[PDB]
């Protein structure tokens, strides 16, 4: 409603770096807000794509940003009559970024890994890896829970059970308020998908450079399965956290599986022990129900509500014809221990191939009326197809069915404006939460400042 579409702020990165593929707000030890930006195709030292991260200080004029440096060199360790190998070429460093406290977590889901033992090997596969940084202190650490040293022959004998070689850890990421990093790995367990959780503090204290294979005892991974409903489900394509069991001491996980049960798609709510509490099934096959998940209390009852995006949903139209437009689902948490019923509200896109619901960002309370609001992206929507971001306001019964404000892309065609979103943070300290929008196709980030209601 009260976002300013006239005076925007533009940050930019190198051409072709996909600057803006992922973003988040970052507060230093003094509470000063900055913008961490991932650029998963930034060039490295060997003039080859390795990804990169940028930490943008808040300036109303925007501009260029300094780099948050990480080690981009391939590593090799000969230990235990084996040869460990990391490969960072085309690893996509910055395909996901998240900030918690004064720590930044940037992940490379396509970092490859292999283990050589004489003539056998573990196979060169994308286990993924995440890089952790404390910018003020310079501390660095890594976390790659799916690295292993089991040779290829063993997996074949055991029918590829517990095969974490293609995890792509860091594909999606989130951090609980207690400081526990949760990584989505949609390729874990032979593309069933898995989750990897570990406290940030224990990642730093247990990491040493050059080890490549080290134990993080406090970590917790989800479990493999023989149920074909989970096969190729990409469990962990998206991840989020919230309170859904009524116990404020426990933190619940929200996991998206957009190809679950033969591309039906699903979203599951679990406890910290990966025990399933609820499961929301997709409405339409190949709609990618679960592509994006968001958690926020929109109706002001104190109970976190769930939003699920299905960007490829095909709406039924006249003459028995379907139209891909995308759809968002709203699930209001019931009072006390009860199951999440049918959707409370269905928001459906308008522009063909607009992919409404590709990203869903909680905005906090934008208009300061006592109800949290959200922003939904249609990266190829709008009458021109350049992209749109739609603001829906909260209310006592959930969300408004019509948008309060529409943000048209200021970028050219193909910018994927809205592919990444992040809100609920006041960056200029004016008392109103603001919105940052990524457009990796144009290698830029746009900042929308909230202003008093007119």
């Amino acid at each position, epitope marked *: 409603l009260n976002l300013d579409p006239v005076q925007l702020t533009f940050y930019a990165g190198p051409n072709g770096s996909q600057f803006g593929f992922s973003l988040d707000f970052h507060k230093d030890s003094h509470g000063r807000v900055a913008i961490v930006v991932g650029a998963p195709r930034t060039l490295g030292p060997s003039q080859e794509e390795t990804g990169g991260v940028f930490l943008c200080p808040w300036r109303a004029e925007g501009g260029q940003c300094p780099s948050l440096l990480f080690d981009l060199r391939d590593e090799t*360790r*000969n*230990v*235990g*009559s084996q040869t460990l190998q990391t490969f960072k070429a085309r690893q996509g460093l910055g395909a996901s970024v998240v900030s918690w406290s004064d720590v930044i977590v940037a992940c490379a889901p396509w970092q490859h890994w292999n283990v050589l033992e004489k003539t056998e090997e573990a196979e060169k596969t994308p286990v993924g890896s995440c890089f952790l940084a404390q910018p003020e202190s310079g501390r660095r650490a890594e976390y790659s829970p799916c690295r292993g*040293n089991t040779l290829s022959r063993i997996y074949v004998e055991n029918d590829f059970s517990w095969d974490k070689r293609y995890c792509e850890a860091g594909f999606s990421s989130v951090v609980t308020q207690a400081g526990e990093l949760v990584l989505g790995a949609p390729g874990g367990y032979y593309f069933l998908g898995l989750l990897a959780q570990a406290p940030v503090a224990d990642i730093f204290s*247990s*990491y*040493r450079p*050059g*080890i490549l*294979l*080290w*134990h993080v*005892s406090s970590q917790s991974l989800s479990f493999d399965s023989s149920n074909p409903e989970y096969f190729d489900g990409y469990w962990g394509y998206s991840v989020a956290v919230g309170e859904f069991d009524g116990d404020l001491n426990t933190t619940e996980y929200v996991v998206g599986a957009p190809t679950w049960s033969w591309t039906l798609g699903a979203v599951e709510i679990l406890d910290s022990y990966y025990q399933r509490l609820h499961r929301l099934r997709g409405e339409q096959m190949a709609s990618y129900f679960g592509h994006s998940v968001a958690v926020t209390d929109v109706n002001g009852d104190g109970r976190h509500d769930l939003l699920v995006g299905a960007p490829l949903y095909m709406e039924s139209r006249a003459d028995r014809k379907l139209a891909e437009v995308g759809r968002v689902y709203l699930f209001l948490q019931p009072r006390g221990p009860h199951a999440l019923g049918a959707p409370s509200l269905l928001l459906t896109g308008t522009q063909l191939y607009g992919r409404f619901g590709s990203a869903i960002a909680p905005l906090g309370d934008l208009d300061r009326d006592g109800y949290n609001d959200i922003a939904v992206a249609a990266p190829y929507g709008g009458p021109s197809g350049r992209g749109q971001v739609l603001v829906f306001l909260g209310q006592s019964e959930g969300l408004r069915s019509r948008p309060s404000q529409v943000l048209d892309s200021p970028f050219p065609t193909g910018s994927a404006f809205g592919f990444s979103l992040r809100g609920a943070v006041d960056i200029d300290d004016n008392g109103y939460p603001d919105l940052i929008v990524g457009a990796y196709g144009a290698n830029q980030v746009a900042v929308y400042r909230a202003q008093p209601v007119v």
Partner: antibody
Amino acid sequence: EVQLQQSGAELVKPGASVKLSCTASGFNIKDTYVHWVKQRPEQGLEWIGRIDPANGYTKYDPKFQGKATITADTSSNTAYLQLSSLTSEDTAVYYCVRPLYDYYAMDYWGQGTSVTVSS
Amino acid sequence: DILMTQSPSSMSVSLGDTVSITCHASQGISSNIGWLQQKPGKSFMGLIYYGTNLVDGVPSRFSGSGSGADYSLTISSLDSEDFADYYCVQYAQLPYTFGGGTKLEIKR
């Protein structure tokens, strides 16, 4: 806290067999590798072998191939070391070892089990 | 197998001295070495892993260094508890092999 609690001292005769144990305390035995080390005053320290309790796969120094047999039961959270056809040279102290962080390290040690072979 | 030559076999030193134990390997092991401590009539305690990294709980007066096939364990300002046995161990290749050992004795 990580503690490796081994069995009490054994006193056996030559030709017989003995099975030592290494129970994990404060952690899951399945977490890391579990090694076995032999110590003697003259010969010093010698590496017997290792086991991954998650799957049971083992490695051995070819010197101990035949006598040493390493196993593990995740239920009782314990790893074992069996010694067969015992000899006076098998009289030694036996330690179970696991790493801290590095997968291939030798950081945490049990108190050690004494073995004495004699007629 | 990799032979681990540890020297000296023993040394007579006093409190507060800065001593250095060395360990030579028959071939390069690329810092894949650990250091151990065995107090009199007791079990082992890990000091160093991967050549330089201190085990959690070990005082900072201990320190490891070296590269290739030559490494060193240094103890700055000896404490009354540091008088004990010390061994090096390589894990670059299987089987793991240990050094002969080094005993720190009180000088008088």
